[PDB]
Design an enzyme around this catalytic site. Sequence first.
Site, short mmCIF file in Angstrom:
data_model
loop_
_atom_site.label_atom_id
_atom_site.label_comp_id
_atom_site.label_asym_id
_atom_site.label_seq_id
_atom_site.Cartn_x
_atom_site.Cartn_y
_atom_site.Cartn_z
N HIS B 46 0.84 -1.23 0.00
CA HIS B 46 0.00 0.00 0.00
C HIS B 46 0.86 1.26 0.00
O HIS B 46 0.40 2.30 -0.44
CB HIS B 46 -1.02 0.01 1.13
CG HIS B 46 -0.52 0.55 2.42
ND1 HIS B 46 -0.30 -0.28 3.51
CD2 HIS B 46 -0.29 1.81 2.84
CE1 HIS B 46 0.09 0.46 4.53
NE2 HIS B 46 0.09 1.74 4.17
N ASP B 97 -0.75 -7.32 1.83
CA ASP B 97 -0.10 -5.99 1.93
C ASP B 97 1.38 -6.21 2.22
O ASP B 97 1.84 -6.06 3.38
CB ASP B 97 -0.81 -5.12 2.95
CG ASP B 97 -0.42 -3.67 2.83
OD1 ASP B 97 0.19 -3.32 1.81
OD2 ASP B 97 -0.76 -2.88 3.73
N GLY B 196 2.32 6.62 8.85
CA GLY B 196 3.77 6.74 8.61
C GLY B 196 4.56 5.59 9.21
O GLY B 196 5.73 5.42 8.80
N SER B 198 3.53 2.49 8.64
CA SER B 198 3.23 1.40 7.68
C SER B 198 4.52 0.89 7.06
O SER B 198 5.47 1.65 6.83
CB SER B 198 2.28 1.87 6.64
OG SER B 198 0.97 1.99 7.18
#
Lengths: 12, 247
Positions: B46, B97, B196, B198
């Site tokens: 993502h 993801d 942030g 991630s």
Amino acid sequence: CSFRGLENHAMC
Amino acid sequence: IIGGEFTTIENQPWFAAIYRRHRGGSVTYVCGGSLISPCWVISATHCFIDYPKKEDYIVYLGRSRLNSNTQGEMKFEVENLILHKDYSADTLAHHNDIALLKIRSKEGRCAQPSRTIQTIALPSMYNDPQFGTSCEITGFGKEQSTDYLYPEQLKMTVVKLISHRECQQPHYYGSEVTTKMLCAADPQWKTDSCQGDSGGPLVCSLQGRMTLTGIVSWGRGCALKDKPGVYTRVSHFLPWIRSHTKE
């Protein structure tokens, strides 16, 4: 757009 | 990271800081990642899906600060940006993801291990800690949901793994969470990953080894009651990682 999952997204 | 503590790269030396260069020349922080071999950083699809061009990205290793150099750091271009072909996005809850960045310096080199640059072990297939286990998360993400700025100094915190049984309850995340995801939260909901963070590591001690159990993926808000952090379950992707790190 302030959530984890939407970083570096065009719509944001 | 909401709550938790400031840290430096010596306390998470596999942590990778990923930036994007714009039209312009201006460089902004994108996401975290984890060094799993000298030439490979693992992160979340993502973070890259809307800008999939490898030439747009810069990866740092050995970096403790967001917008200032750390002594000993290494800077890399992205030789290959590999996204998971079965990625899917709801309004929240990303499937598959997971992403790989093959890193290469201007001099054509991969990571050189040092006091500030080390790899993290992958888990054994389908081998995760029991629910209730304390694990650590690391990143440059927001310290408060309402903040405009990211912190300048790296942070980490501790969250506890939540069973799929508990996370799939309607008053948690219902059908949004799958068995290829791991939920983790603080019992008082007072500390969490946030925007942030991630792509960065969820690290657990499993049979005495520090293990990349999870990758920061999504959540509703940050440090909210009954809204855990959701992490890609790395132990369910070993064949995908094994094959794509040969590219």
